[PDB]
Scaffold this active site. Sequence first.
Site, PDB file in Angstrom:
ATOM      1  N   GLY D   9     -12.160   1.332  -2.472  1.00 59.06           N
ATOM      2  CA  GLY D   9     -11.926  -0.059  -2.798  1.00 59.06           C
ATOM      3  C   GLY D   9     -13.145  -0.919  -3.028  1.00 59.06           C
ATOM      4  N   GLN D  10     -13.013  -1.880  -3.946  1.00 57.82           N
ATOM      5  CA  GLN D  10     -14.090  -2.762  -4.334  1.00 57.82           C
ATOM      6  C   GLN D  10     -14.961  -3.139  -3.162  1.00 57.82           C
ATOM      7  OE1 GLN D  10     -14.194  -5.752  -7.063  1.00 57.82           O
ATOM      8  NE2 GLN D  10     -15.558  -7.079  -5.814  1.00 57.82           N
ATOM      9  N   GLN D  14     -18.811  -1.456  -2.057  1.00 55.37           N
ATOM     10  CA  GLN D  14     -20.042  -2.239  -2.052  1.00 55.37           C
ATOM     11  C   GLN D  14     -20.696  -2.324  -0.686  1.00 55.37           C
ATOM     12  OE1 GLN D  14     -18.320  -4.865  -4.717  1.00 55.37           O
ATOM     13  NE2 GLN D  14     -20.248  -5.528  -5.682  1.00 55.37           N
ATOM     14  N   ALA D  95      -5.173  -1.769  -8.905  1.00 56.88           N
ATOM     15  CA  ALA D  95      -4.100  -1.780  -7.906  1.00 56.88           C
ATOM     16  C   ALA D  95      -3.419  -3.119  -7.787  1.00 56.88           C
ATOM     17  CB  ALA D  95      -4.645  -1.431  -6.595  1.00 56.88           C
ATOM     18  N   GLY D 140      -5.880  -4.606  -2.574  1.00 54.29           N
ATOM     19  CA  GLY D 140      -4.937  -3.641  -3.122  1.00 54.29           C
ATOM     20  C   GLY D 140      -5.159  -2.176  -2.817  1.00 54.29           C
ATOM     21  N   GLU D 179      -2.893 -11.621   0.440  1.00 53.51           N
ATOM     22  CA  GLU D 179      -3.690 -10.913   1.447  1.00 53.51           C
ATOM     23  C   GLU D 179      -2.975 -10.400   2.672  1.00 53.51           C
ATOM     24  OE1 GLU D 179      -6.574  -9.639   0.227  1.00 53.51           O
ATOM     25  OE2 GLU D 179      -7.623 -11.636   0.338  1.00 53.51           O
ATOM     26  N   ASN D 202     -14.771 -11.138   7.637  1.00 50.25           N
ATOM     27  CA  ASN D 202     -15.596 -11.739   6.616  1.00 50.25           C
ATOM     28  C   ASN D 202     -16.067 -13.129   7.057  1.00 50.25           C
ATOM     29  OD1 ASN D 202     -15.186 -10.996   3.033  1.00 50.25           O
ATOM     30  ND2 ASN D 202     -16.100  -9.780   4.683  1.00 50.25           N
ATOM     31  N   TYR D 220     -21.610 -12.037  -1.926  1.00 44.90           N
ATOM     32  CA  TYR D 220     -21.052 -10.793  -1.405  1.00 44.90           C
ATOM     33  C   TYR D 220     -22.172  -9.867  -0.972  1.00 44.90           C
ATOM     34  CZ  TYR D 220     -15.978 -11.182  -2.078  1.00 44.90           C
ATOM     35  OH  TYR D 220     -14.655 -11.522  -1.926  1.00 44.90           O
ATOM     36  N   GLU D 250     -17.444  11.673  22.567  1.00 46.17           N
ATOM     37  CA  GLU D 250     -18.155  10.978  23.670  1.00 46.17           C
ATOM     38  C   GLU D 250     -18.921   9.742  23.195  1.00 46.17           C
ATOM     39  OE1 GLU D 250     -21.104  13.671  23.755  1.00 46.17           O
ATOM     40  OE2 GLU D 250     -22.718  12.503  24.776  1.00 46.17           O
TER      41      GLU D 250
HETATM   42  N1  GTP Z   1     -17.273  -8.184   3.129  1.00 52.38           N
HETATM   43  C1  GTP Z   1     -16.976  -7.981   1.843  1.00 52.38           C
HETATM   44  N2  GTP Z   1     -15.713  -8.219   1.347  1.00 52.38           N
HETATM   45  C2  GTP Z   1     -15.409  -8.009   0.037  1.00 52.38           C
HETATM   46  C3  GTP Z   1     -16.359  -7.544  -0.833  1.00 52.38           C
HETATM   47  N3  GTP Z   1     -15.800  -7.436  -2.052  1.00 52.38           N
HETATM   48  C4  GTP Z   1     -14.505  -7.805  -1.976  1.00 52.38           C
HETATM   49  N4  GTP Z   1     -14.267  -8.196  -0.693  1.00 52.38           N
HETATM   50  C5  GTP Z   1     -12.992  -8.602  -0.113  1.00 52.38           C
HETATM   51  O1  GTP Z   1     -12.086  -7.601  -0.506  1.00 52.38           O
HETATM   52  C6  GTP Z   1     -10.833  -7.971  -0.028  1.00 52.38           C
HETATM   53  C7  GTP Z   1      -9.827  -7.343  -0.993  1.00 52.38           C
HETATM   54  O2  GTP Z   1     -10.075  -5.956  -1.176  1.00 52.38           O
HETATM   55  P1  GTP Z   1     -10.754  -5.392  -2.535  1.00 52.38           P
HETATM   56  O3  GTP Z   1     -11.668  -4.154  -2.388  1.00 52.38           O
HETATM   57  O4  GTP Z   1     -11.568  -6.502  -3.073  1.00 52.38           O
HETATM   58  O5  GTP Z   1      -9.478  -5.038  -3.497  1.00 52.38           O
HETATM   59  P2  GTP Z   1      -8.971  -3.555  -3.964  1.00 52.38           P
HETATM   60  O6  GTP Z   1      -7.637  -3.586  -4.748  1.00 52.38           O
HETATM   61  O7  GTP Z   1      -8.883  -2.663  -2.787  1.00 52.38           O
HETATM   62  O8  GTP Z   1     -10.138  -3.133  -4.977  1.00 52.38           O
HETATM   63  P3  GTP Z   1      -9.883  -3.563  -6.487  1.00 52.38           P
HETATM   64  O9  GTP Z   1      -9.738  -2.264  -7.271  1.00 52.38           O
HETATM   65  O10 GTP Z   1     -11.042  -4.358  -6.940  1.00 52.38           O
HETATM   66  O11 GTP Z   1      -8.565  -4.355  -6.582  1.00 52.38           O
HETATM   67  C8  GTP Z   1     -10.923  -9.505   0.063  1.00 52.38           C
HETATM   68  O12 GTP Z   1     -10.842  -9.911   1.418  1.00 52.38           O
HETATM   69  C9  GTP Z   1     -12.297  -9.896  -0.444  1.00 52.38           C
HETATM   70  O13 GTP Z   1     -12.825 -10.951   0.323  1.00 52.38           O
HETATM   71  C10 GTP Z   1     -17.622  -7.300  -0.358  1.00 52.38           C
HETATM   72  O14 GTP Z   1     -18.474  -6.895  -1.123  1.00 52.38           O
HETATM   73  N5  GTP Z   1     -17.929  -7.518   0.965  1.00 52.38           N
HETATM   74 MG    MG Z   2      -6.586  -3.745  -6.223  1.00 50.57          MG
HETATM   75 MG    MG Z   3     -23.225  15.322  27.436  1.00 51.12          MG
END
Ligand code: GTP
Ligand code: MG
Ligand code: MG
Lengths: 427, 419, 428, 429, 123
Positions: D9-10, D14, D95, D140, D179, D202, D220, D250
Amino acid sequence: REIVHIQAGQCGNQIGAKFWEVISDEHGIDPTGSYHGDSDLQLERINVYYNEATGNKYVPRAILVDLEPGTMDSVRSGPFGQIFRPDNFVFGQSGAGNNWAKGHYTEGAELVDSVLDVVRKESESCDCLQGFQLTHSLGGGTGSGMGTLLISKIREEYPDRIMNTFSVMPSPKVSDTVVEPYNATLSVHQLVENTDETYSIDNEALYDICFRTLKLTTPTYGDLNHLVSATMSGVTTCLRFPGQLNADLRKLAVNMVPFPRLHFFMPGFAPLTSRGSQQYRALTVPELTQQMFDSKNMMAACDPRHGRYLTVAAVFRGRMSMKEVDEQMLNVQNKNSSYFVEWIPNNVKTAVCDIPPRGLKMSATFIGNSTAIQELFKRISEQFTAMFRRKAFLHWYTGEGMDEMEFTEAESNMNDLVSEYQQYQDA
Amino acid sequence: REIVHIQAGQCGNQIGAKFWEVISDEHGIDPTGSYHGDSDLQLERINVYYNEATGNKYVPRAILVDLEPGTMDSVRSGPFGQIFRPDNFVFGQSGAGNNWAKGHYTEGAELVDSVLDVVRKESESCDCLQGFQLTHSLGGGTGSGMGTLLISKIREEYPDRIMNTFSVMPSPKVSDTVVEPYNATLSVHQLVENTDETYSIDNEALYDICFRTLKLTTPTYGDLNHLVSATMSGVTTCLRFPGQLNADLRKLAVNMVPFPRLHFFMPGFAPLTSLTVPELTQQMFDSKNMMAACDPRHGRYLTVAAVFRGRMSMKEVDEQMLNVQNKNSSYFVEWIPNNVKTAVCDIPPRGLKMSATFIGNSTAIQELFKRISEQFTAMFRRKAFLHWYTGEGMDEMEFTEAESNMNDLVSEYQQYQDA
Amino acid sequence: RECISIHVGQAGVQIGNACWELYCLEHGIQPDGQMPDSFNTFFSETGAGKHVPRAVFVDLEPTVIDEVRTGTYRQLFHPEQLITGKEDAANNYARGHYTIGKEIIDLVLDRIRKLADQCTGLQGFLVFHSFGGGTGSGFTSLLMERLSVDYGKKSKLEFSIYPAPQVSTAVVEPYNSILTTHTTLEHSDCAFMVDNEAIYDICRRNLDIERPTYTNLNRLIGQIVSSITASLRFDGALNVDLTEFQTNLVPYPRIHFPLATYAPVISAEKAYHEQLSVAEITNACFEPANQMVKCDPRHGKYMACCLLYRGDVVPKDVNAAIATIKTKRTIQFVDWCPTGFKVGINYQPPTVVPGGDLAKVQRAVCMLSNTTAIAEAWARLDHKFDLMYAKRAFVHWYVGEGMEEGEFSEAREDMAALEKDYEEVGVD
Amino acid sequence: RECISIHVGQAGVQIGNACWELYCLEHGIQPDGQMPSDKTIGDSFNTFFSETGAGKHVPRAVFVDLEPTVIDEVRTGTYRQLFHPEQLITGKEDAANNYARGHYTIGKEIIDLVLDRIRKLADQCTGLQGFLVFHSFGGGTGSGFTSLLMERLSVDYGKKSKLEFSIYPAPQVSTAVVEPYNSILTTHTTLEHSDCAFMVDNEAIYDICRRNLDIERPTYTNLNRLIGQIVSSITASLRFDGALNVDLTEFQTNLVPYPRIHFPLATYAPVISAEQLSVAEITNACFEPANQMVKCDPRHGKYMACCLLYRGDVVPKDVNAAIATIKTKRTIQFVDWCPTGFKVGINYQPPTVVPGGDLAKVQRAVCMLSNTTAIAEAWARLDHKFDLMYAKRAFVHWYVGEGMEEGEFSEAREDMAALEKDYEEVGVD
Amino acid sequence: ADMEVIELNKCTSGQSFEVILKPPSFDPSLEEIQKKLEAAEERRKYQEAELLKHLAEKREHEREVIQKAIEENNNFIKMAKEKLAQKMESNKENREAHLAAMLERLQEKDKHAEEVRKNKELK
Ligand SMILES: Nc1nc2c(ncn2[C@@H]2O[C@H](COP(=O)(O)OP(=O)(O)OP(=O)(O)O)[C@@H](O)[C@H]2O)c(=O)[nH]1
Ligand SMILES: [Mg+2]
Ligand SMILES: [Mg+2]
Ligand SMILES: Nc1nc2c(ncn2[C@@H]2O[C@H](COP(=O)(O)OP(=O)(O)OP(=O)(O)O)[C@@H](O)[C@H]2O)c(=O)[nH]1
Ligand SMILES: Nc1nc2c(ncn2[C@@H]2O[C@H](COP(=O)(O)OP(=O)(O)O)[C@@H](O)[C@H]2O)c(=O)[nH]1
Ligand SMILES: Nc1nc2c(ncn2[C@@H]2O[C@H](COP(=O)(O)OP(=O)(O)O)[C@@H](O)[C@H]2O)c(=O)[nH]1
Ligand SMILES: CCOC(=O)Nc1cc2c(c(N)n1)N=C(c1ccccc1)[C@@H](C)N2
Ligand SMILES: CCOC(=O)Nc1cc2c(c(N)n1)N=C(c1ccccc1)[C@@H](C)N2
């Protein structure tokens, strides 16, 4: 990932033209050829609105439908004329009628298949087609009637992909046809079951924005299209530009629509005018916020006072700091805290893209699921059954191949959508 | 007559290492080869702790078990490294877990048979194997859990021969795992039915002996092992040296244990770290110098052995020995008569002119069991961290089955404050 | 006529080795066996050169028996006459009698029968053994049960080492003594107890030895035993033969235990002081200090008394010496038996171990008394046993090897009843 | 022994890229993979990387997302050299901020491939330990694919434990309204297939930067550098080999007393901006609601298992008396039935920060892993959103749409309710 | 007390003799037990053959634990292999007739649009 565009009807088409040439400026495209501009961004997301062809060249992913030559050779003879691929034009020959049925049943279905044949290409050509968008009038057949058909035929072929329209809700003031209410109620029905989002745009607004807010005496279909042209760039930007969002169009809808009916965003804009009026730089952020949140600056004629925002997106334009943006954004949620719903929690998100539009240093655009949209619908059904009284103009459809109860059958499908938004004055 | 040694677990092993190199000094053995020293005794009873191989050579009778490489290549890479026969090392590979079950049931039994396979061939080689001794931790699996298994599988194979351990009872202060109480209580059960003597050694003590008694700020697992290393040489000496005793190991046990459970000698030592006779004596009978975290005050001595070291006049020795049994006469039981015997071997240890070690069967040891069982029930309470053993295939009540076995051993020691 | 020595147990063995040594000095046998009727009472004239002891030595470890096939004397026995047995009895009677015994007994018993077979009219056996302590208590007991079966009249004289806290190591001691002493006593004829403590005592007072060795203590016991056996090695009237031992010493089947007292224990270093008078040494025999078992016979009644003299002595002297033992010291006789003193003169001057601790003496005396005050140590024992069994103390080691919880009960029972006979002999 | 990282996931991706980055600084690997330290044939840091071919040092990771876009920027900026083109799976269509899409609709298709591409990496490992799954809570693919992964990983891998790092989602830097549904959905299917799980709020991170770094409105990649630091202080134990925390059991046998209760609360020590602190003072920071890692208040919830993970120049001779006056000054706060904690983990390896990053090179840094009952504060602060929406069917129809069940929602909220209960049920006697 | 000795013998190297001082004043071994020593062994042989029949006990309890664990584990895998693909083929079946439930609405605004030109070409 990639989006195609259907643009049908005299009103649908003359919007489409201005849209295209405004966004075509932002990316910077010669009336024919390719890029000319010192910027470099543009082209990351030009992918999405432009299927590119051989030589240099860029050509829009556009289909232009009309049920008569007239208005197609207006584009081709006008501004960004010969920009669209020659046989992406779907000609009409016949009448349009300004009549829903001709466009949705007889003279429409007569064509249709030929349109489906261009779309099927561009979309089937399109490497990951995400969805279509469409522009058109709602009072008057070739747009409202053909398009509502198009969309119906568009789905079923593409269930799958998401649908999307800028439709032009017609007003008793500033219009051509007695009948339009009849026309609108018939498509409104159609839309509410086949689109995923539908930007509402009253000509009652559009005209009102020019005489209440511009001093503009004789408002054309020109300066007035100008607004829609702009507002439409506004909305699109973040599918076509930065990379600070990422704007799936689907994501975009899922996060805009609570209830599967009722996808009726009334839009709005920041600054305005074109001719003999300016702005002495002063578009300040604050005065840009309580401006896009001012009703006398809405693209549908409602009033997001009586009627509460379900969800609300805004997007900002210009090399300005957003460290002020969330903080003005905050403020309005306290300065007008009452009229957001509470039951969907963080229901006004806002983002910023920073390469300005044509002219204009700083600008804002507001997307808006307001149940105050009830205001718009309830205005049209107010003059619709004032017509379906002892059934007036109806006789044009009577014989065209339409049914008695079928008007009433949609008079009703609307009358539900009315008292569903009033149902979401919740707890 | 001859004894083999099992040394299992990171704690068990790093003790074993220090032990071996200290006694290996006393006899004088090259990191590989044979004897180098002007003394001549050494080799009479070197028979007992060293099976000797070809060339010159001497090699310990040692087996080293662990459920992961890590701490075995520590010995082989450290002090008296390549002294133990190469394939007397029983490797682990897998996890250890710091969890009793893994070591007594799943990942343990997975090995075990390979260990039994080294022991069987050292002991079967051994011309008159008298018994085995084992070293290990009691809070943490590879030692407390494998070993308690080992000893169960070691008997049955050798009923016959006598068993014996230096086990290290863990403390809430200076430890790694939340769970150790669970681990200990599970092996305490095991031990109390399969060993013949068990030297109790608190790390609560070990540590305390360093900060109230040594001005040593940051106590390692190094200088702390050092004590056990020493205390272990102490205890062994007379099966491995003079001929003024003769110390069958069995004889040794029969004369140290009245009642077949309760073989829980808390030890102690004379001097400390990197001495006159009186001031050696009224120091080995001080609590501030016991090896279990007890105070041999609240609880009387069952039987008590002391072993003295250093060419000194022992005419002084029992003259001071008697003295403790009168200036402290209340605190030994009456109902076993000559129940505090001592012996004196004169070949001193690493440095140190005079020294003494105290093996003590004291009911005050109950104070150490109580203390674990106290933080054990307070844990088995709402059935805490137990879930790490739950799904390891252990029983709900199999804990309570050992929790009670212990609370018995408490109120038996208490039932020997009699008349 | 003939006479076989059995020594079971570490203690037995070393007492043995340290009085075979002293026999050897007395009869002039160089270690190898060769010396350049009479003393054939103990040794046999085997082959043409040697003089092998009529002995058999058994222990359950090697170790001690091993020392003998080491230091000269190694030449003196027959490799056969020393049985060793691999694993120890571990300070525990049960082990000695039932567990580890079973296995070796059939062999020993038969290796004795080899020695009895080269004898035309064998007399009896001398069994040397530790009281407390493992094989000493346990094997001895099983031996006697069996020797009693394999040998009819043929009497048995035992020399027990009654055990002492200061030089022991074992806690479980008492159990083992009270145990053996029970099974042992109906198979025994007369039995000389020897209290380690009392010997340890003599050395600390009389020899100036700071903390005395085992081989310190043994040389002393060696001397005493060799003054008892004396009668049957040189042949001089009184105790010619084992039968007589009892006839003079034991009035009652059970009461075996005579008290011994050896006369002039004095240390070379004092070896040249004007030596002691026939009178004074007699007048020592009656001194709780110079005793052989720690007690006090000045308060218990005597019931049979012997004096065994050795050395340069005319009886003329002995008499008037005894006379003023009466008119000075404590008479102390029982209700119904003469007033003792069967007196044994043996002209053979007493020899001591060459670089030993005591000196060459002109005259030495030996007093064998059967007093009822030797039952003092019958209780000083018992009490220990009692005060342990009361808690089951060390029992479980026994039930362990195979014994009966109730066999313990039953032995204390015997002492209780004995301690009673011994009280039951005073006055009337 | 060995140790595989999955990032779905995004957000996952990262965070990942921003700590594989920090791993690389810590172990001295120039981007292209080669390191000029004598530590390769194929011990020490082989936990994470594999000595593939004769020159390079590939991470034992796999990267999955359902768009390209994000996975795409890896095969872009140097580090492009670092992975194997295999180990980054991308998947054409998105997604769309929707679990149902992630788990059932778009998942179905890619899972078979991923699962097997993981199985490649497990096969070049003699005794693999467990997986680290990085992923976003809300959102997603992060909620929905993750969920499906774990169901499957649970099936294809026996004992082999699973540690998840979740990004608990925050109104201020999100964009997604839907969310809450997504988080309470996954978290339910996910929790019986997980072993111990570090949530990262976050908001609390956004918070740290706005207070401690002077960043006006933080990016980010601003937030990620911070999380990168935290994770790397957690994983620290098994990478250099620590004098404690030296295996996955452990390491955590320590943290989770009860099967359900995974979620430990993290707290990073000296966050201070370039352009030094006492052993005592930094420890006395760990117990400061500000410096926390999940927005709550543990001064009022009970603690039930406490770790301290130190990193840098430290003699234990300090740690102790510092702790001592954490008990005679501040809020002790212990549960009815477990010792009074403090498994203390010393790692002499001084902490490295990202070169032109935000934070400075620190002498000593602390890490505190606490299993307190006050972390359930964010279990409701979530729930409540979910409740107050589902109450109107709010956004549901997007889910029933992709294929889901009206009742599967009911059922997940059922789980948090019961969980929110266990967490309340651990207070006192 | 001055007494008279009752001379009792003389030989080569000695002389015995009583010395009465003041008048006195008038006042089944069993062999059968060789069967006692294998009575002792009657109870040893029982004891060690019981810390065997109690030890080969604590043994194949280990068989349980060791496996009544593994046997409770796969008990979870083959619970959760269908808690999956029978939740997930309930899903494929669920959507697909929610696609049809979309399409069969179309054939219905479609085979009605058809019949309202066959009604224009008749009005
Ligand atoms: N801490 C942090 N949160 C992130 C970052 N990028 C996105 N988010 C958070 O990601 C959450 C949603 O999940 P995503 O990975 O962005 O969505 P996903 O569907 O799983 O990935 P996509 O394919 O982009 O849709 C939200 O709460 C955003 O605030 C990041 O680089 N760092
Ligand atoms: Mg998604
Ligand atoms: Mg030991
Ligand atoms: N007088 C004397 N007593 C001894 C001697 N050796 C041991 N004892 C005593 O004997 C008792 C122990 O008896 P042991 O003979 O050692 O026991 P054992 O089983 O017969 O001998 P082991 O074969 O070693 O077990 C203790 O009271 C010791 O004090 C000795 O050499 N001389
Ligand atoms: N703003 C915008 N609205 C228009 C324009 N032209 C017409 N309209 C409004 O939309 C209605 C329908 O448009 P029309 O093109 O005539 O329908 P057609 O039959 O599809 O050509 C008109 O009747 C007006 O109310 C246009 O130029 N721009
Ligand atoms: N004294 C001694 N105790 C130790 C040592 N290492 C660990 N321990 C203790 O033993 C207990 C855990 O033993 P551990 O060796 O970790 O378990 P194992 O490796 O599975 O045997 C803890 O209470 C520690 O305090 C050491 O080397 N020496
Ligand atoms: C064809 C163009 O696609 C459309 O017709 N309509 C459309 C446009 C949106 C939008 C949404 N849902 N639908 N949401 C937005 C948003 C605002 C704030 C934060 C995140 C996203 C911005 C990008 N504009
Ligand atoms: C494995 C190594 O040794 C043990 O395990 N146990 C053991 C060691 C002992 C010991 C005893 N009872 N048990 N007693 C001694 C003793 C002290 C005084 C008198 C008699 C003996 C001294 C020699 N050492």
